[PDB]
Design a protein around this nucleic acid. Structure first.
Lengths: 117, 214, 51, 106, 130, 196, 167
RNA sequence: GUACGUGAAAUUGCUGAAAGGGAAGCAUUGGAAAUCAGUCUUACGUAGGUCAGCAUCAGUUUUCGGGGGCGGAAAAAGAAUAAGGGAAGGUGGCUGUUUAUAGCCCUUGUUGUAAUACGUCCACUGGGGACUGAGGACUGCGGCUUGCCAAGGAUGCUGACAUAAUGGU
RNA sequence: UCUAGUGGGCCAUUUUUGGUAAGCAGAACUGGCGAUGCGGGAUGAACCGAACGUGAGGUUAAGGUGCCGGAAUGUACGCUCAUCAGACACCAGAAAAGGUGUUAGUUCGAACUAGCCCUGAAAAUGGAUGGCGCUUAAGCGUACUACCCAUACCUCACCGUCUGGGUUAAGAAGCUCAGACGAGUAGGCAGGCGUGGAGGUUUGUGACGAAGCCUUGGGCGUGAGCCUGGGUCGAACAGCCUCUAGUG
């Protein structure tokens, strides 16, 4: 089953484009007269549970794997039996020495690394 | 192994012969009406045909702006949605129900083709309060088998001829969920059928409408 | 069981499953076919063609 | 130079739309010489394309093509509905399309 | 495209067809039946030509099963000069020998097969019949 | 039916609105349209009624800077372009591109007097009005609301017609010869089974 | 598309009326349902019968015996207007009673803005003698009738190359 | 670098790019330009990336065509052919008349179990196009003749490209 | 059983009272708006149609198909000529009485009778059948087809909720099957995301760069958010289970 995304564009907060104090992070409009809350035609959409994605393809990368965060070699060995379900993702705070060690650990496991380079 | 296949082989032929008998009954009744009408024309008198005992009602209006009495009656008819069809045993009580909700529904006399294709293409049973399609005779037998209704043809015969178990057969059948009519309605949909609309009683004209929705 | 609803009127195998009678049904039978005995009374025709 | 043009000339009229709401997924196409829905039935299922020219050389080609298929007739005047692999740009309203003679059945 | 060809036989899905190579230079090829407009021109006798050896295996390409391909020498390879088997040339010549007499006998058909079909101004294929 | 790269339309005997509706649709279809002899267009209804309609149109003007308000063009071709403009979505970029695809002119200028001029039967007065109904000419309507080149347009028109008549006789002389030589060839009667 | 229907009906028998009378009507309606409705409409205004206490004993569709013969039909109607005090007699020449009624309905709606509900057809009779015949109908009955073809606007065929001949 | 850890936003200058006919911002769909990841390469004839074409099917649906049963005034007509009746919007003939050197209308017989139209039905049939392929060993209900099957949801035969080609920003 | 919000309403149908009348005041029955998007009536809170999970296909409602504008410059029969015609319900307004205007009727040429047109008809920025325009209409009355399209209907996929049926061979708090369904202010409840501090835990990350910050890089989630590449930076910080609060 190939991965299908019901929606690809983010749900940006209303009027976040016009005001810098208002951020992109989605906030539900509580206004009494809000056009977007009332779902006027032409206004921005709102997050709904109908937009949820297939349970089989949810959390899946386009390659079909799930990026599992990794911080040391023991974190890699947790993916020993799940190398066709998860892909190792080395954390940003891991130094270069363990980054090399995790990469050789993951290549030995056959586990793909999302940010190997 | 072969014991089951032999026993069901017998059961399947019992279904076949009853279906053959039902079709023969349909043909005989149709011929008798034709000959009786022909006799009346030849002798110069008038033969009043049997008034219909079976009625098919389609809900043509949506679920907005409905008086409580009409809304109650349509709920009793299981016409919850627009373009929903039901088979009704026609009597005095039903006649004055359909009189009240006449602005909101249309109805008429179904023919054999209308009943047959409604139950075949849009036939769903109410099995444990669930809408289970009639894709096997086991489904109908497991629900209506206590009334000797074992097959789709038995259910069609009970519905069409208004048998002794018509209430159970009609309530077993889920309210038919018809599509929008191919070709459209008349120009104005919410007048009476008499005054150029499509609401109200329409007698034999319900068959063309049902074939538009099937 | 029954993952897909198949229309028996379009699927001859499903029609065979539900109805073990469509095999031998013989729709078209020549009924009226010996003298075509036209049956219209003279009084019937006069009332029909009256006024 | 009249030994070519195995296609029929057509024009992209508009998207399929109501009075105010457009549906860019399917388009309205006027095929020349097609003046009724009975004539549109012949062009149903034909392969229609939009051919345009670009400065960048994709695979050494200045000409790039968006393909599509005639789906159904539209109206009574011979216009047809067309579905393309990429929805036709809205700037092509009035531009020309090529309707090939394949998949042929004549 | 636009060539006029003579159908030899109907294969599993397509038509094994060739416009006589001495007329319009179209060799024996499979052509899918949805990409041809059959004409009402008088039939050519193809009963005397063998069509059993024109099969899917006959027209089958060489198996590759790998992503490596393409080269200037690769394009210098293939070509009619190379690749093209002598048996394929002999079969083309044999079918030509068995097909030319019929189109010679019926007038105007030899040069008709040589010409190329094209649409002109005002031509409406739905009204036109072939 | 078939689109040409440029279509030249002779507006003589045509109705303003019917022709404008056809022209506006063709312009939106991506077709380049030239309309000549706009002074020969017709408007259904008698002259004084149409004179009153234009005078009512003339009154429309801003109280501040009439140089901002509606600009009332008195030329017959500019009256035609006004009708097409109102039938196009000209505030829209698609509508503007359609407007520059239209060239409406009085008379038949030299880039177009040597080109074929088609007519639109959906807009022809003889086909579209009941006989005995009064109608007016846009050229006369223009001349008595401000247009000042009705005479020069006419005088240039007979000169064009005289030259066109000379061209026709020369072409008809050629067609007489080719027609006479047509039946001389035996093949003309040989290809009679083909319908030609 | 109207149709002529012979509608015969009677009230249901009672102790007071063991043998009710059969009443027949010729009336034009698009279908049998409207035909029965109009029958009950006319029987209700005259003779104390509902649809409920009556019944339609016979329905028949009458076709024209001579649909290929030109005839003159005189139609008496009751016309209801904004004032509603009107009887009319009109004459229409065609080959069938159904067409004459249809042409009457179109003419009556055109000239008087009368609707199907407002008009009730008193009687449709075939006028056979030329002397019995409306001036326009008589002058169609002229033996020497001849006149030019009236204007008839003669695929899309936009942008004609030549000015039409129209003659 | 003391105007000193880190150094955000508002706001500002420079550079690059882009846009602009009396606001701008946004949403939707695609184009263009820039940018970029996945996938692949392999693994074991076997299976395998991306994208297409066609066939055979299944679901849904639209649009044309043919054949047949049945119903009505067992259509009305009409044609052809025998009686009688009447006449004209009066033909040949001589304004007036009664098929003649044109014919028409009405009734009946006949050809007749006439045809067609309309209505209705066929578990009768031929095409064309569109969208969808959910599920994932086996079971089930059926048809055929145990195998097969269009029967409890798409497979088969190929080609091109393995590319920024698809896809994303 | 406990408790929230509410205790300014408004409009329409029909009936009706006060009033000269009112976009006025007051009630009755129902439906609505408030709390409600969508299709349509150019535009509008209550009009018409239809009530809304994310999508694909098909088909309709109301209403429309000259052009703007998707869809017949369709069919049939008439009426109308307007010296500032008419053009679709609510609705954004006009009457008596006439008019050698005209088309049809009724009864004894005369009168009447109707339908359309004109007159009666009359303001102040320039402008409104929505505009352009339209006259055997693209106006009006009737009839009949085809066509266009809503978030409504139908089939299907997916999300969630609820309901029902299985599962001792399956973080049973799991797995599995089926059906119906999905608008929402005030308000109630539930499950989640984020922040500071505390206990436990993870052979947890870190000067080979923690935290923070910048980013036309990538990835995940319906979302709150989360992860990551590159840049800057220089000393600490995090996952999970629980505790807590000056927690968004």
């Amino acid at each position: 089953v190939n991965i299908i995304k019901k929606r690809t564009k983010p749900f940006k907060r209303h009027q976040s484009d016009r005001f810098k104090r208002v951020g992109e992070s989605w906030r539900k409009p509580r206004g009494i007269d809000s056009c977007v809350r009332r779902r006027f035609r032409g206004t921005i959409s709102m997050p709904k549970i109908g937009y949820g994605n297939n349970k089989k393809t949810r959390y899946c990368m386009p390659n079909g794997l799930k990026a599992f965060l990794v911080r040391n070699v023991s974190d890699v060995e947790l993916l020993l039996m799940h190398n066709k379900t998860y892909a190792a993702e080395i954390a940003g705070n891991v130094s270069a020495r363990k980054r090399v060690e995790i990469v050789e650990k993951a290549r030995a496991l056959g586990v793909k690394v999302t940010n190997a380079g | 192994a072969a014991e089951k296949k032999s026993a069901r082989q017998k059961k399947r032929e019992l279904i076949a012969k009853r279906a053959e008998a039902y079709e023969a009954e349909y043909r005989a009744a149709e011929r008798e009406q034709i000959e009786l009408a022909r006799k009346a024309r030849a002798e110069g008198n008038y033969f009043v045909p049997h008034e219909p005992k079976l009625i098919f009602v389609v809900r043509i209006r949506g679920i907005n702006n409905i008086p409580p009495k009409a809304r109650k009656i349509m709920q009793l008819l299981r016409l919850l949605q627009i373009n929903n069809g039901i088979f009704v045993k026609f009597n005095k009580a039903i006649k004055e129900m359909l009189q009240v909700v006449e602005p909101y529904v249309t109805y008429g006399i179904p023919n054999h083709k209308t009943v047959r294709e409604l139950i075949y293409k849009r036939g769903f049973g109410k099995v444990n309060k669930q809408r289970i399609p009639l894709s096997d005779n086991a489904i109908i037998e497991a629900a209506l088998g206590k009334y000797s209704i074992l097959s789709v043809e038995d259910l069609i015969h009970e519905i069409y001829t208004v048998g002794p178990n018509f209430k159970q057969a009609a309530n077993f059948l889920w309210p038919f969920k018809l599509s929008s009519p191919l070709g459209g309605w008349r120009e104005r949909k919410f007048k009476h059928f008499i005054e150029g609309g499509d609401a109200g009683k329409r007698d034999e004209h319900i068959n063309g409408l049902v074939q538009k929705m099937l | 069981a029954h993952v897909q609803k198949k229309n028996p009127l379009k699927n001859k195998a499903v029609l065979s499953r539900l109805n073990p009678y469509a095999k031998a049904y013989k729709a078209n039978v020549k009924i009226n076919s010996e003298k075509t005995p036209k049956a219209a009374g003279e009084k019937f025709l006069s009332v029909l063609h009256e006024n | 130079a009249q030994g070519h043009r195995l296609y029929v000339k057509a024009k992209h009229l508009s998207f399929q739309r109501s009075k105010h709401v457009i549906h860019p997924g399917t388009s309205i196409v006027k095929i020349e010489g097609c003046d009724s829905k009975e004539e549109a039935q012949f062009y149903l299922g034909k392969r229609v394309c939009y051919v345009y020219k670009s400065s960048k050389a994709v695979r050494g080609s200045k000409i790039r093509v968006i393909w599509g298929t005639i789906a159904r007739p539209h109206g009574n005047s011979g216009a047809v509905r067309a579905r393309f692999v990429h929805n036709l740009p809205a700037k092509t309203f009035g531009s020309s399309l090529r309707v090939m003679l394949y998949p042929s059945n004549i | 495209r636009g060539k006029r060809v003579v159908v030899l036989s109907q294969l599993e899905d397509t038509l094994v067809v060739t416009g006589p190579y001495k007329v319009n230079g179209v060799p024996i090829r499979r052509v899918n039946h949805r990409y041809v407009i059959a004409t009402s021109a008088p039939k050519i006798d193809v009963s005397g030509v063998s069509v059993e050896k024109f099969t899917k295996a006959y027209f089958a390409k060489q198996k590759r099963s790998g992503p490596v391909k393409k080269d200037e020498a690769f394009f210098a390879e293939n070509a009619p000069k190379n690749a093209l088997p002598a048996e394929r040339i002999a079969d083309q010549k044999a079918v030509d020998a068995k097909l030319l007499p019929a189109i010679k006998a019926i007038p105007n058909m030899k040069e008709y097969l040589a010409a190329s079909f094209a649409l002109s101004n005002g031509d409406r294929p739905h009204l036109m019949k072939f | 039916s078939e689109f040409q790269k440029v279509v030249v339309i002779d507006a003589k005997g045509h109705l303003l609105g019917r022709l404008a509706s056809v022209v506006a649709k063709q312009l939106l279809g991506g077709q380049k349209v030239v309309v000549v002899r706009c002074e020969e267009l017709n408007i259904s209804g008698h002259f004084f009624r149409n004179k009153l309609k234009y005078l009512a149109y003339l009154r429309k003007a801003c109280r501040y800077n009439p140089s901002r308000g509606a600009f009332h063009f008195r030329a017959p071709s500019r009256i035609f372009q006004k009708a097409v403009r109102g039938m196009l979505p000209h505030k829209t970029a698609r509508g503007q591109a359609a407007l520059e695809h239209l060239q409406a002119v009085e008379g038949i200028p030299p880039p177009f007097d040597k080109q074929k001029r088609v007519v639109v039967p959906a807009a022809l007065r003889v086909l579209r009005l009941k006989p005995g109904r009064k109608y007016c000419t846009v050229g006369r309507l223009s001349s008595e609301v401000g247009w000042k080149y009705n005479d020069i347009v006419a005088k240039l028109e007979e000169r064009r017609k005289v030259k066109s008549a000379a061209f026709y006789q020369a072409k008809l002389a050629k067609q007489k010869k080719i027609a006479s030589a047509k039946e001389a060839s035996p093949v003309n009667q040989k290809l009679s089974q083909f319908g030609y | 598309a109207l149709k002529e229907y012979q509608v015969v009906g009677r009230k249901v028998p009672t102790e007071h009326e063991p043998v009710p009378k059969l009443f027949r009507m010729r009336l034009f309606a698009p279908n049998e349902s409207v035909a029965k409705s109009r029958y009950w409409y006319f029987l209700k205004m005259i003779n104390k019968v509902k649809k409920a206490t009556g019944e339609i004993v016979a329905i028949n569709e009458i076709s024209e015996p001579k649909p290929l013969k030109a005839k003159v039909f005189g139609i008496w109607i009751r016309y209801d207007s904004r004032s509603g005090t009107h009887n009319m007699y009109k004459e229409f020449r065609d080959t069938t009673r159904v067409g004459a009624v249809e042409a009457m309905y179109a003419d009556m709606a055109a000239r008087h803005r009368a609707r199907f509900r407002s008009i009730r057809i008193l009687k449709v009779v075939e006028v056979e003698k030329k002397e019995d015949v409306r001036n326009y109908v008589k002058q169609l009955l002229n033996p020497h009738l001849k006149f030019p073809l009236p204007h008839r606007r003669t695929g899309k065929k936009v942008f004609a190359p030549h000015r039409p001949s129209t003659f």
